[PDB]
Amino acid sequence: YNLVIDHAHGATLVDVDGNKYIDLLASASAINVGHTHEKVVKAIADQAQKLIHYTPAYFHHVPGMELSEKLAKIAPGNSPKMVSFGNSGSDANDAIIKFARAYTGRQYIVSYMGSYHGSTYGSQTLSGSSLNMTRKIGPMLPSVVHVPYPDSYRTYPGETEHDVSLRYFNEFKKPFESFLPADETACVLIEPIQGDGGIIKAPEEYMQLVYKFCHEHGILFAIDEVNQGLGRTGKMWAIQQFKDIEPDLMSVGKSLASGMPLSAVIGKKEVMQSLDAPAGNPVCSAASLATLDVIEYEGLVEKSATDGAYAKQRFLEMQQRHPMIGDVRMWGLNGGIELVKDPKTKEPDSDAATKVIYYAFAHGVVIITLAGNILRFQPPLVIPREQLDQALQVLDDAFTAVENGEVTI
Amino acid sequence: YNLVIDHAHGATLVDVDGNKYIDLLASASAINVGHTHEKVVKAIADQAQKLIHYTPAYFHHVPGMELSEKLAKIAPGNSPKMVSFGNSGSDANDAIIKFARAYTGRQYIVSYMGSYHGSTYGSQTLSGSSLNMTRKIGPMLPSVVHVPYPDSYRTYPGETEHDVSLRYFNEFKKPFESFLPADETACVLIEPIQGDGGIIKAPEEYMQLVYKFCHEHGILFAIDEVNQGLGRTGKMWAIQQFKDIEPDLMSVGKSLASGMPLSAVIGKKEVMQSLDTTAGNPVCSAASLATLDVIEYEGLVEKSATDGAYAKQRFLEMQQRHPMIGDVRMWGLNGGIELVKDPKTKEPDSDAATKVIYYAFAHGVVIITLAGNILRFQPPLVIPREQLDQALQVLDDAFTAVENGEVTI
Amino acid sequence: YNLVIDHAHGATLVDVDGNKYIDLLASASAINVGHTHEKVVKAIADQAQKLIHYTPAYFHHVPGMELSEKLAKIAPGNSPKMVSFGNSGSDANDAIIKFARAYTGRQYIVSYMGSYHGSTYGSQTLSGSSLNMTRKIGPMLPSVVHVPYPDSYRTYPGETEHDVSLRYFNEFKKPFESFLPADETACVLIEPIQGDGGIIKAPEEYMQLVYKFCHEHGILFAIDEVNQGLGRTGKMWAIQQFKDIEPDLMSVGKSLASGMPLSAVIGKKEVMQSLDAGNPVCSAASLATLDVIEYEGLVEKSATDGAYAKQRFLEMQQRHPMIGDVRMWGLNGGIELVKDPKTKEPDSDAATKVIYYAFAHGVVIITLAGNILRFQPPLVIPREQLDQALQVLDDAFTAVENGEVTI
Amino acid sequence: YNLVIDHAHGATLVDVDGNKYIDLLASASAINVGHTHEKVVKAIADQAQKLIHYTPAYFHHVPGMELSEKLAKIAPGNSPKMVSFGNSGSDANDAIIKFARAYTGRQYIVSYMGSYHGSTYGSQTLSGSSLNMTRKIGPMLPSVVHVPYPDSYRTYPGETEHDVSLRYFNEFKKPFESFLPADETACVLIEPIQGDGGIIKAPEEYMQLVYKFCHEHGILFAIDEVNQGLGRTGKMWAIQQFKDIEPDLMSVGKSLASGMPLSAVIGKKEVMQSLGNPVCSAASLATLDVIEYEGLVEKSATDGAYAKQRFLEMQQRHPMIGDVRMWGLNGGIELVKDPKTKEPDSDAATKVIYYAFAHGVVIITLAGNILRFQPPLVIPREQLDQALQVLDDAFTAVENGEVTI
């Protein structure tokens, strides 16, 4: 924005002029635990003194070593895990293909519509989000198939939620009853809940079906936790929001260390040993350890859930007074609050979603839209309930603003 | 390396037992400035006080603005440039492919055998050092073609450095005169002096031939300077070892940030204009600024040259007593010590190198090998002479022991 | 049955032991005109006298030249065509991808599920029915996206031809809305009716929705008349079962020369010159087979014979219920067998029994996707045979309803 | 060219006006048996009355079977074989990619620069012929690598045969000693003598040394003789000009059915196992007998060595003929601006081709400075001498400089 950024602590952002802003984008999930958090600043700085950089290849450092343990330990499920480290969720998704393809000796990758696994040649190929248009830069990474994601808002007449999971599971089956063998596809990468596609969840009835087909045909079941991890959902991992799921392979990046360039691939021991190198960094390891501690100490996973239920209840009543709110998809501090021209037609109102970004930003609170009309509500999980209401307030006048036909551009 | 590192500073590494070593490796030249340099340590620690992360698209930031100017000034050439961020050497090289293809509307990439470019599907594919970067993970990025790089030691009886360039240039042109059309190759991509090849420099004549070729046929000329720039070589960058060449694109990762995971694409203003996650990081740019400071303040480039030159003559003297050091190729504090059985046959001595490197470790110097038998000598540029004299002395005796066979596994 | 065929004529495979069979075969279109039609034979025989082969990339020759012009006028639309000569269906469909990639400047190709466009590395990618065919041969041609063909049988609880087209065109756009760029998409290949996947036709709305999307976004609109052309559907071309749709590209094989290895790519003048660029005998066979379809009026014959046979194939369904669905457009149908018309679950068991019952009673008939018996006799077929083949199949429905048919 | 044809017999061609020409192009060597040989015409005649085409994807027929036991035996090597049929030499190598990939389980195919494997996306990635190249139709089929072919004419001053074999093999490995996992390469497909590349034979040592390598790694060693087969070369297959090499997979085409669309993949049984036209098959049935009975393997060897000699004496006077390659009635005759720089002289190649055709011999250029001497193998000595004089004159009517474009 025209006036550029200075410092920030928890939820308050401060730019060059001293202007105060309430945060809700939280850097596409990273700011899980606020900005400049004292234990994580202390850990950064105290580590930078000891050793800035050495690589997991040739030498061990301690914190990355202490980190690895804590990440196999915290990981979803009980099977013996192992972590590989990366720089970004972007490069950890690449790895998930490398691993998948190695263990299974297989080529094809089934990734999703609506999804955004990243920005390197492999993770850019796996994605398919609105803005995320890989124009001019093809050909992409070969042997990748896409499959639709269970849309819940936009449906045929009289579909139950049981029906969605049947109709989208049918769509998912469709290439495997055609051109894609099953004994050839090495991996299904799924967002348990989609980020960029508009804070969309898949029904459990669906994921289980997908988590069976994967298990029945030997195709690795990988989950992308870069955006929806570390309490964001109200449980510690988005995958846990479903009953009994043990991902073969999982990615996390971004959030892991309050925005320091770190990432992990957490999967099964036998999967993690089909390559062996060269087919980690200390300060962000130290930061990771510091954020992990904060997640556990401040009851943050719970704060994610308790504030998460509350905010749902605030967007529900607020939808009642402003019929433009077409859907509200909250699971944790984790909203998908999407605007529509009419509630019958459910047509996007990207016009109305951008105006609300303008009112928000101009009246002391920062938020953004995903694919056009859905506002992504992903605030830092240490937002004092106070600050949150002042966000909700402004988000509310802004609704009425655009309703009464107030702010222009 | 059978170890855990406690702490480090400059060109010394301290293990947890308390032992010290000269870091002759410099951790794949991520450390030209050394470990934990004061100005970097206070760059990291002060900026973490203020901002840990926010991507340069919602609010932009103070050092994310500064380094993004300060990077473009200092590139090789006169011509307007913009610079895009990332984290790794790898992920910047993905971006090269991208910027190249986009600009041109073309499809193919040309890369060299024996170069490492990274471990993301893009960069991973262009490489040609170790075979594990394909194995079990195919297919690789489409439309990529590996040519040979010039070797100036393993020559056919009596080739003058002209014959090397012209024979390798001829072996260069062959894909274009067979299956590959010059009008769909977006870019050559080439490390000015290879790393994992064996610190191997292409002749001037080879470079201008390839360079003109690129401009004649609309192919962009790209350089990987991850290993070889930032004072490494003798001049600030490795291209300035050649008469007026100007990169269309250029990458650096690694030593951009005294070890931190930040990285830069530097394209010619035109190439960059088509498009533009932990990338840009405020702590990291802070770190990176400080280390350019030091390259200037501490005279690191002019020093790199002189210490480099000195380090070359002691090996040239060390070659003379010792029959085994086949090639000593070196530019700045940056050389390769390819040991061989006999100096006529020119046949790899993988054994003698390991023997050299092991003994060195159990004598207070950490050096490592490449392509079997080549001693990778790329220390921190800040190295004090006394230590530079000490590593040098240790390695001299290493040579003496092997010739006696006084070394064993 | 390791069935060794010695000689043939019209709609009569006769083997080596002296047996007589009623063809209605398949493995894609092949026998539109008929077996060893005196017209065709004579032309090959006498063309053989003159010329075996001299590749047109050197000298030119008369039959090729007549059949370049012949096909260029007689292929649907107004726009000047030019026509490029492949050896088989495969190397016409491989060339659509060339032809579209060269003209548009765009890499991506959009093709259908349950389709089959050819067996070489280009077209095999495009295809999508035979899982067999795409095992242990990766990687295939890069940039190719698959979109589900319209299924008018297995609907959702009482939906309309209008509901289907939307639902199926939504899916068609899902790619374009996520990861595929419409402006980097060279073309969509589409069989106007899927051959090797159960004789299945897009509703009218779906074709105009796609065609309209194609043209607006700069994507060429490809048709495949490999299986479905040459008066099979009852019009000269399957695309002419739809309204004012002139292809940008069009592939034909098989019966182009009654069987003699010939295929054509027939697009627009401009499109066909994008690249920097046909057997004498095969072309004389073809040039005859083209006169036959006009002369014996086999386009007109199919339509009538076909609808007649539709009502015939449909009262069979109200006595014998196992037939879920009767699909027929001209002498071009696919009779589809199920457990129960509420479950619609394939009963491929019953089907391979009818093919065996019928193989024992002088009538060869091979199956699609297990349960779907494909129905593609040679169009020359006389009514006494058609009925002598149609009565049999009915007798079979009786027999497989009994468990009289065992293996 | 701008010319329409009407009839041809054996060696001789005739356009619709009546100007008689002589074949040397020979339909890119699809006409080995000669044009409209009676046994072949009588074969298509007979069988087209019997069956045009019924679909092979299902049940069987007799001409195919007879051919598929015939070919199967006349293959090179003593190991058991199985054949697979296509419509063209292009789709046949498309199978060679496929088959290799099923058997081995590996992706990477390795093909040679200057290679002509054909024109579908499979054998057009394999291919490496410049004037046959694949602009605006990329992306091409992944995991195809192009190692360079031994050119035994452009050498660096004073290299033995052995040297070229050492060096091009040292090029061969450079992929594998760097980015290409040898244990993940499905097959090396090679033309033994490169057709469209310029009539270029691989040295004895180099072929062995690849066969060796390939054998050492489970890399299926493959051969395309779409061009160079059926006795074009003086031996039956062109491979038998080498020492005890058994192909894992071979590709036959073109002159299989005297030009009628017919292809073949002749493989070791073991390789084909675990993964066609009734008229054209009959056509090949006869064309094989004509090769056999009219005794052509040997005629090609005999006329081939007469053709070689005369040409080497043509070079003694005309120093524009910089290289004379020849193996059977099969040769490249490379035109150069200079006996010592060896610069391609296209310009002249153009005019040579212009003269010759003006005087009733057909002949064309390979990479625009190599004349593709490849007549039908039943060209009588008479005609063969008529061309050799009409070519002889051409070189001198360009030495004097008369021919115009």
Binned strand content of chain A:
15-25%
The helix/strand class of chain A is alpha/beta
N- and C-termini, Cα separation of chain A: 14 Å
Oligomeric state of the chains in view: homotetramer
Q: How many domains make up the coordinates of chain A?
A: 2
Topology-level CATH name of the largest domain in chain A: Aspartate Aminotransferase, domain 2
Give the CATH level 1 class of the largest domain in chain A. Answer: Alpha Beta
CA-based gyration radius of chain A: 21 Å
Helix content of chain A: 25-40%
Largest β sheet strand count, sense and barrel closure of chain A: 7 strands, mixed
Q: What's the CATH H-level homologous superfamily of the largest domain in chain A?
A: Type I PLP-dependent aspartate aminotransferase-like (Major domain)
Order of helical and strand elements of chain A: EEEHHHEHEHEHEEEHEEEHHEEHEEEH
Spatial strand sequence of the major β-sheet of chain A: 4-12-11-10-7-5-6
How many β-strands of chain A, per DSSP? 17
